[PDB]
Amino acid sequence: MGPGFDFAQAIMKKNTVIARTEKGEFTMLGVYDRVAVIPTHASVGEIIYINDVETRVLDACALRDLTDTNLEITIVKLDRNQKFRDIRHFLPRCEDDYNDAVLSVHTSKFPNMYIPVGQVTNYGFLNLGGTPTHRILMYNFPTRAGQCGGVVTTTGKVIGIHVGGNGAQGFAAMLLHSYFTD
């Protein structure tokens, strides 16, 4: 409808795939080459389905900060025959608060979904499903099951992936430029 939705659609149409694990279907953001992100609670194994194609996982790494605290981001390298558009230049370098964000989701269940979630708070610490978690972003939208892995964008920036909510608020793990250096 507007500049926020335009940037969100541009990311979804070229840099997402449908990832299926034993824990369900997730929006999965491709970042560069064969390197993608997904919430750690997807429990990525040796094999993953990508747009319903059986795919070998060449590497998977569940990120923690230097306090040794969960970040809820798993970086995956896929045995895929095609590279993602490189979108690393849209990633923020620092932790920050943001205005006017969109959460975008694409699964079997929720195709072509875009949610104007509004202002994003640098919330920091969250006990997420019983696990202490750092670098959390919060938005006052009642997000629901099926939205995990959804991409959080502003005009110009890809800032996070949806990892959970409490019925009134939704929570995203930050994406930072430094996670994806060469």
DSSP result, 119-157 = EEEEEEEEEETTEEEEEEEEESS---TT-TTPEEEETTE
Looking at 25, 51, 84, the residue that finishes a domain is 84
**72 is annotated as an active-site residue:** yes
**41 is annotated as an active-site residue:** yes
Catalytic one among 72, 106, 134, 162? Answer: 72
Looking at 42, 63, 84, the residue that finishes a domain is 84
Phi and psi angles of residue 7, each rounded to the nearest 5 degrees, phi first: -65, -45
Q: Are residues 100 and 181 in the same domain?
A: yes
Q: Does residue 163 contact residue 128 with C-beta atoms inside 8 Å?
A: yes
Q: Does residue 145 contact residue 122 with C-beta atoms inside 8 Å?
A: no
Q: Does residue 120 contact residue 53 with C-beta atoms inside 8 Å?
A: no
Q: Does residue 105 contact residue 27 with C-beta atoms inside 8 Å?
A: yes
Q: Are residues 73 and 158 in the same domain?
A: no
Resolution as reported, in Å: 1.4
Q: Are residues 92 and 30 in the same domain?
A: no
Residues paired with residue 76 on neighbouring β-strands, in sequence order: 36, 60
Catalytic one among 25, 106, 148, 162? Answer: 148
For residues 148, 91, 61, 167, the Cα torsion angle rounded to the nearest 10 degrees is -20
Q: Checking phi first, is residue 33 left (phi over 0); if not, alpha (psi -120 to 50) or beta?
A: left
- Burial of residue 179, with CB atoms counted within 10 A of its CB: 0-12 exposed, 13-18 middle, 19 or more buried: middle
Q: Are residues 119 and 179 in the same domain?
A: yes
Structurally, how many domains does the chain consist of?
2
Looking at 84, 109, 139, the residue that finishes a domain is 84
DSSP 44: -
Q: Which amino acid is at 164?
A: G
Instruction: Give the H or E element holding residue 12.
Output: helix 3-15
Tell me the residue range of the domain where 115 lies.
Answer: 1-15+85-182
Q: Are residues 55 and 93 in the same domain?
A: no
Q: Are residues 4 and 29 in the same domain?
A: no
* Sequence-ordered list of residues with C-beta below 8 angstroms from that of 166, at least 6 positions apart, any chain: none
**Which method was it determined by?**
X-ray
